[PDB]
Design a protein around this nucleic acid. Structure first.
Ligand code: ATP
Ligand code: ATP
Lengths: 150, 370, 150, 370
RNA sequence: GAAGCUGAGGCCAGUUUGACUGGAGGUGUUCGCCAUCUCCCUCAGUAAAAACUAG
DNA sequence: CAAGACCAATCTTTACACTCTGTGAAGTTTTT
DNA sequence: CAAGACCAATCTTTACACTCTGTGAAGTTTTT
RNA sequence: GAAGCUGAGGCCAGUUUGACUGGAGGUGUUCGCCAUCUCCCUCAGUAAAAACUAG
């Protein structure tokens, strides 16, 4: 898979909306003025801020919340298989290892690492962007290399 | 478009008939007298219950139905709100690595009534309901608030169990919800609140939640409208916390996902009940020993059938308890299916316990016909 | 007069630049690439943020400063004469009084107020916009009506 | 383009000839021995002075000229920097309504040398200057730092009066300047620093600067690299503060402009000197009583002319003092003309005192020819 | 002064010549009764809001 | 013990007069 | 006594192999 | 334990039978020697950086 879930809280027309269980083709239908393109705007702003572009923050659904959050759960099982293997010693693979999957396999011990390796691998990377009321943006991961690589 | 209430709004859809006599004779709407309120003691806590026959109960109910349900709230308030649930309070914290839990001491008793007036003022038009004597907002707060006879010094009080008290508490605490949410967001902390229990979680590798500075800052904020932090219930842990039995764990680091699972202390009572059911213990003993439900002899309505009455009552109570716990775990299963954050092996254990509960309820119902 | 001074700190090409003693015609000359239009951009951004428009904050001259400040000192002597007088009781005049010159003559006492009235009147209004490193903007006056009126 | 220093940069333009012998024989650059450093006592403070004949003094001077002058600093640092002056430190606060002043206890002694190494590391290339024994950065810090003989426990120390010590202090404190400036900006406070004296001002109507929370936050920040706040010099006032005689006042409210003026305590000495000059007091008495400058008999170079020598020396010292104070107030006048923030009536008083000073210096010079 | 705490009793066990404290164990641990595996009775009194009736 | 930081909404903000210009002289669980 | 918040710069981040697809079996003032 | 403080003495005045503390007043004030108006001697020792030489 590619994306496990997308969650929007208090941004544009969404109060608390979670989209998950994506398939290969995802047809979006609905009446006029229901937010179908608002998902597009949210994803576009999230990816523009992912590459550290300078853009205006999106508007809050209601002003009685001091935050607006966008959460992306990337599915890195296949990339983990790609990079963890000993054959792929390339420089791009080494960068992906040293940026994403390092400091995450660091905390685990030998038993848990071997359990993850042998069993059905399922690894996710959760990234949350929070827009405060004063237009500041705060990430849940403070390493910009991680965001650019994602 | 915000909700606005005028004289016709109170007289037609709110009052309907509860205070028709006061509005036709232009007589002031009276205080909630002590005759309409009974004082229950539960623990060290004191509950205030209004009588149903009083018009104040009916106007409180229609206030809750039509007025307090439209005022916007803060999304950090997960309690007493349409669609809010405990699992929602405990969910945003699966993304965190360190957890902290704070409590507000006597949240409902410490709500100042003037704060309630200020909070409800923008949503109620400033008019004179009864001549030039009592204003509309004054009449509505007379309906909502109460004067504690035990403690007359503090004056008007929002009591526990006054139907409309929870929604009013959420509305009056929206201000602090906004303040504390802004502070936590600037610190990069996830914040949520259920009634008065506040939960914070840090998704970063840091010791902010375990420091005294965080407690001091939250207390300094809470002192704005006079609240205090219960120092006995303050808790701070890393990588795993347990809140009333529901354990949130997150052993990971960067971009990790935690899991929520009930522990064995939580499932001890239902496991013991199923064990007693499988051991053919009589229903009366099971109901009295574990479910703390007993048939007092003063509650028996008729003396015509009593031996059958007791058996039927205990059968029904066991059925109701089993169905309630079945629906409590079904709620857990539905929450997991919607958000995918409950432990998978704990999901298997839930499935096993639910199958056992369903089989036992089927056996009891089949025996009912024998 | 109209503007007493304009001060820019750490924004665009300016480190700490103060322009004052304006005359009726102010000819700006200088070599190519010296910041002549950067003054335009700074003033334009200050006035766009004055009306609470949503625009991207300007870039910092050097990133070793956590702040970037723009200060405008408006000369309100003539407006004070306009509005303080008892003849002009219009609604626009009343708004200007109740927004700008109220809460400023409030703090003064009778002696100081009479001294200001009788002597050569010289009243200024200083407004400072500070851009933090996280794109938040903070004013030195927290009343948006004041900024819109200015 | 940041400044980078390599082996050729040290050997050609920095060392020139001070350490030619060490670089041609590949001998390690030695520590600054106690023989090159004399220990002066001023007050409870201790100053360390290097001898000029030592090559370390010359390499310190050329380091200051060519290397430390190019590393970017923080604009909140108004001291020891090209173009920085005390009046600049005291100016941004004319816009504030409440003032607070803090001090760092023993700023120069509490600078950790490892922090200096970390701060200078990105600007010096990592090479081996002398074979494989001593690195380039190690040699440069050997030139810059010193080991205190009185207190050998703390090891290498940046001492007071080591030519390059002020610039190094600014560079090593740039980190905290950034941190504290960011915190104050988020709080809406104007912040400035001169050496170790920190000044904060709030332009809003609030009591933030007078609260203990602000001190606690600044101390918590300062503890990151081990500094402390001198609690004796902490000051907080409203609408007017006096810092070493320079008074900043702001009686206004919204959008007001304060004024800076020296007080009478500051001008007491110059007024007394002018008064004594107008009273025909002899020059020796004026120089000894007020200017605390005296001609010690051990300082007389020749015995050929001594009665004339003493008179000429005291005449020159009085001329120099009057010219110095004349230029100090000219600096005040220039600052006022550039920024327009000094009190107008105080500007008139400055003009009067300056005319008096000029007339007295003219009279003394005319008497010199008689 | 501020803070915090729990319904009323009766046998039996542990501490007491005469009354007070608990009524599965194992394992780990941030030592929290916190987490995980396996396997005492009576009598009062018990307000409110929300979630939840697997698939 | 006591304290900075005390929601977001809510209402015609465009000129006056003498002076043609100047402004003035019968379920579970949680909070509890 | 002790603690969250510990600058901003600084270096090829785009594929590998067996597997044609899968990732692996001699001045003043200030700091002082 | 942590914090903070000031060069060495000699007459004269105030507190002490025998040694220690200050050497314009007025006014206001956040009481800080803080602000504003008017009008004791000797002897040591005195590093560094920056601003400033009205117009
Ligand atoms: N800045 C905003 N703040 C709040 N709500 C907004 C904002 N921008 C858009 N909306 C709301 O979101 C909706 C905008 O329509 P949107 O384009 O998201 O829907 P759509 O289904 O894509 O429309 P269409 O069917 O025409 O393509 C409207 O309900 C509008 O009220
Ligand atoms: N975002 C920025 N950050 C830093 N410096 C900037 C930025 N934008 C512009 N500059 C600097 O400001 C100058 C830009 O030229 P500018 O237009 O300000 O001058 P100008 O005198 O108006 O030019 P011209 O004479 O061609 O009209 C350059 O020195 C450039 O380096």
């Amino acid at each position: 898979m590619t994306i496990e879930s997308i969650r929007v809280k208090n941004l544009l027309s969404f109060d608390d909306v979670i989209l998950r269980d994506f398939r290969d083709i995802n047809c979006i239908i609905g009446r006029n003025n229901v937010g179908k393109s608002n998902l597009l705007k949210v994803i576009r702003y999230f990816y523009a801020k992912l590459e550290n572009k300078k853009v205006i923050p999106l508007d809050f659904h209601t002003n009685y919340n001091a935050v607006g959050e966008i959460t992306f759960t990337f599915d890195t099982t296949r990339i983990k298989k790609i990079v963890t293997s000993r054959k792929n010693n390339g420089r791009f693979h080494k960068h992906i290892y040293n940026t994403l999957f390092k400091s995450s396999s660091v905390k685990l011990n030998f038993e848990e690492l071997i359990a993850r390796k042998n069993s059905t691998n399922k690894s996710f990377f959760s990234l949350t962007l929070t827009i405060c009321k004063d237009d500041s943006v705060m990430w849940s991961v403070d390493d910009p290399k991680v965001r650019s690589l994602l | 478009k915000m909700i606005l209430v005028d004289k016709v709004f109170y007289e037609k859809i709110l009052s309907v008939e509860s205070f028709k006599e006061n509005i036709i004779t232009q007589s002031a709407i009276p205080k909630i007298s002590n005759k309409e309120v009974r004082l229950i003691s539960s623990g060290s806590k004191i509950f205030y219950a209004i009588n149903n026959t009083s018009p104040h109960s009916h106007v409180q109910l229609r206030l809750n139905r039509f007025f307090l349900s439209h005022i916007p709230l803060n999304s950090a308030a997960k309690a007493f709100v349409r669609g809010g649930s405990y699992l929602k309070y405990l969910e945003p914290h699966i993304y965190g690595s360190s957890y902290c839990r704070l409590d507000i001491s006597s949240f409902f008793n410490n709500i100042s009534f003037d704060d309630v007036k200020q909070s409800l003022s923008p949503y109620i038009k400033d008019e004179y309901l009864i001549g030039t004597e009592q204003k509309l907002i004054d009449a509505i707060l007379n309906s909502v608030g109460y004067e504690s006879p035990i403690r007359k010094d503090k004056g008007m009080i929002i009591p526990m169990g006054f139907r409309t008290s929870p929604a009013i508490s959420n509305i009056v605490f929206r201000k602090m919800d906004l303040l504390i949410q802004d502070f936590c967001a600037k610190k990069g902390v996830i914040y949520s609140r259920y009634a008065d229990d506040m939960l914070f979680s840090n998704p970063r590798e840091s010791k902010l939640l375990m420091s005294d500075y965080f407690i001091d800052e939250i207390s300094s904020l809470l002192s704005i409208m006079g609240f205090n932090i219960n120092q006995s219930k303050y808790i701070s842990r890393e990588k795993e916390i347990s809140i009333n039995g529901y354990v949130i764990e997150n052993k990971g680091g960067n971009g990790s996902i935690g899991t929520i699972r009930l522990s064995k202390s939580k499932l001890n009572t239902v496991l013991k009940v199923t064990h007693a059911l499988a051991q053919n213990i009589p229903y009366k003993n099971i109901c009295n020993k574990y479910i703390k439900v007993r048939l007092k002899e003063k509650n028996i309505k008729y003396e015509s059938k009593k031996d059958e009455f007791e058996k039927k009552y205990y059968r029904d109570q066991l059925i109701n308890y089993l169905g309630g716990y079945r629906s409590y775990l079904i709620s857990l299963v539905k929450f997991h299916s919607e958000y995918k954050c409950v432990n998978s092996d704990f999901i298997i254990q839930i499935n096993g316990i639910l199958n056992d509960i369903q089989n036992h309820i089927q056996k009891i119902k089949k025996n009912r016909r024998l």
